[PDB]
Every structure is written in structure tokens, then in C-alpha cells.
């Protein structure tokens, strides 16, 4: 708690995501950098917002992944894209 309060940002490494094969194990949405895009180069700053939002959509569609056979093709696209980014 002390170190969480002191620092500028957190990189949460997760055991479930490490056993699941996501080797860097970084848990998005809970990991954060309060400096953000100021730290970042113009090209990376331009491109990375797509990743941010794509994984945001993927998180909610992952619950539908069990029965994603019956979904709107727009939602199906968002899910397949979240999977391929992940």
C-alpha cells in the first residue's frame, strides 16, 4: 500500500495470465501510468490508443466467447480483434 501510494504508476504481473501463456503477464486496465502519453514518442502515441481501446472491448466480449457463435458480426469482429491483439 505504501509503495502503491508513493509511485507514479503500476505494472501488475498476474499469475493467471502467466499460466495461461501470456508470457509478459501484464494485466491491462489495472496497470496504469499517470505520466502516460507525455512519456511517449509521437508514432507510439499515435498508434497505442487503438490497442488500449481494443483490449478494453476484448475484456467485455471475453465473457461472450463461450457462445460467440450467435453474435452480431460487429461484436464478433471486436472479439476476434481483441483475441489477435492479445
Amino acid at each position: 500500500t505504501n509503495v502503491i501510494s508513493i509511485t507514479d504508476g503500476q505494472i501488475f504481473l498476474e499469475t493467471n495470465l502467466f499460466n495461461a501463456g501470456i508470457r509478459p503477464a501484464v494485466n491491462p486496465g489495472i496497470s496504469v501510468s499517470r505520466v502516460g502519453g507525455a512519456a511517449q514518442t509521437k508514432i507510439m502515441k499515435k498508434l497505442s490508443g487503438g490497442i488500449r481501446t481494443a483490449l478494453a472491448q476484448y475484456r467485455e466480449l471475453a465473457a461472450f466467447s463461450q457462445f460467440a457463435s450467435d453474435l452480431d458480426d460487429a461484436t464478433r469482429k471486436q472479439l476476434d480483434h481483441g483475441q489477435k491483439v492479445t
Partner: protein, 115 residues
């Protein structure tokens, strides 16, 4: 890691870990909603994971008294081949109990025939 174990062994171990993790998630769904509610892919993963779980069991020499049965020794090469065999389709058709405290994969078929 591959620099010691080689890619063959590393890939086999990581595959087993991923399968068991996925099954640990699916088991919670099953416990309330029932296995009929799953995807057929998830049903197959649950089946093959529940097999791998039992294949990791091995009767031990020192535990002869406890198990009333003779213990088994397995080589690393045969172990790798057995887990590859369960991760693919070769033994999709054997029951779960055919793997329990067997020994090599080459005699799990024998327990299945006995079961």
C-alpha cells in the same frame, strides 16, 4: 526454459500448463450452469484436461504398501511422448479412470481395456 530443456520439452510443458489453467476456469462454469452449457471446443478441452490431470499420477515403488500395487518408473522421453499424445487426439476415446495411477501411456490403454 528452451536453452536447457530443448524446445520439445518446453513446448510440451507450456501446453500442459495452459490446458490445466483453462480447465480450472471452465470447472467453475460447469459447477452451476452444467457442462451442456459450454462450447463444444470447451467441452473437448475439459475432457482432455481432466485426462491429463489423472495421467500425471504415477504409482511409486516406496508406496507399495499403501497402494497394494507395484510401482512404476518412466523415462523423460516416454513422459514427453505421453503428454503429447493426450494433448492431441490419440487418446480422446479413453475414459478418465483409464489414466489413474497407471504408469506409461502405453499401459493406460490396457487399464481402459480392463476398466
Amino acid at each position: 526454459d528452451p536453452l536447457v530443456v530443448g524446445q520439445e520439452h518446453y513446448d510440451t510443458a507450456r501446453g500442459v500448463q495452459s490446458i490445466l489453467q483453462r480447465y480450472q476456469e471452465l470447472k467453475d462454469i460447469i459447477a452451476i450452469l452444467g457442462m451442456d452449457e459450454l462450447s463444444e471446443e470447451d467441452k473437448l478441452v475439459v475432457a482432455r484436461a481432466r485426462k491429463i490431470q489423472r495421467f500425471l499420477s504415477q504409482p511409486f515403488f516406496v508406496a507399495e504398501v499403501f497402494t497394494g500395487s507395484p510401482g512404476k518408473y518412466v523415462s523423460l522421453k516416454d513422459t514427453i511422448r505421453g503428454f503429447k499424445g493426450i494433448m492431441e487426439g490419440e487418446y480422446d476415446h479413453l475414459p478418465e479412470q483409464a489414466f489413474y495411477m497407471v504408469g506409461s501411456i502405453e499401459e493406460a490403454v490396457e487399464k481402459a481395456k480392463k476398466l
